[PDB]
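S2.1 Query sequence (Outer membrane assembly lipoprotein YfgL)
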Amino acid sequence: VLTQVSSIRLDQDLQIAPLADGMIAASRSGIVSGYMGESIAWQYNAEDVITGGVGIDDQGSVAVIGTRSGKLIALDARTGAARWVVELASSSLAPALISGDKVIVITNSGTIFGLDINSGATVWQYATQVPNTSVRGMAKPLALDARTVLIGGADGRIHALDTMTGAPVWTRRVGLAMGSGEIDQLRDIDGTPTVVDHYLYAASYSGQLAGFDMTTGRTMFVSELSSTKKLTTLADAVIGSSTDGDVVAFNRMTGEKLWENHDLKYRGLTNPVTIGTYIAVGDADGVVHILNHQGQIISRANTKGALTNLTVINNRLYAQSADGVVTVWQF
Ligand SMILES: [Ca+2]
Ligand SMILES: [Mg+2]
Ligand code: NA
Ligand code: NA
Ligand code: NA
Ligand code: NA
Ligand code: NA
Ligand code: NA
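Output structure tokens follow.
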């Protein structure tokens, strides 16, 4: 199903930012490399541990990284030159979203920051509530349309914000606390919600996967799936990876269970991704498993290093390991 196309060691949960003729990848040690094909076009040293990235506009022209110390840096995607460097009151563990003239950042404090794309100035802030202990990591903000951004919160809610002002447009509860204790409160939506047409899906650490009809604002279903990873869709199936290492599929209109694969239990799975008519999910041994649409494993590609995130862009599957290895496959 997959043929290896590249295997690159990065100079020393970060995501690759694919470009039309290459890619941008950051090492957690601080080096952001812009690649043209398999050769380095540029490098930028952040002089700090990179905790969030690589964010990229849909036009492939500006890249964003967040550092452990709360710095947020915008880079020209072609040259690697910094456009601006600002310091926020909190660090980010997810890539920044670029929408319109805004860079939108989720942070440890629960604050969502709306930044001016040209200067990095803070235009707006939106505070979400965060339990004293929450699940480590966060969801990348998502542009619903030109005027609405969707935030997955540590409070288990989806927050819909006006892109220009930061004001809340609406919210929905997905993750549910089971009490006041530190374990019982854990309910993060740490996987970026999934939009297909006017339908919205999100899952949560506490075990709820909700499907929403954004046209009516109605809840279509709530099913059982504890997850910290982005969901994927395949025709009428919505599919996710559980915190137990299950891969499970639901009907994305009714919420009924389609299939559930237990072969990868406890392996530490990435988000599952859709590759054509197949599904791919990676694990902590560096193995990417390929599933058919009936949830049966038919193939396995192996890389070096633990995987936590898979990215599909056009025809290629991108994986960045914790060992700093970036692997690309085509399908
Ligand atoms: Ca979290
Ligand atoms: Mg998380
Ligand atoms: Na990266
Ligand atoms: Na690098
Ligand atoms: Na982005
Ligand atoms: Na962010
Ligand atoms: Na609803
Ligand atoms: Na998932």
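The pocket of magnesium ion (ligand 2) is lined by residues 135-137, 188, 190, 228 (CB under 6 Å). Residues 1-331 form a domain with the Methylamine Dehydrogenase; Chain H fold (CATH 2.130.10.10).
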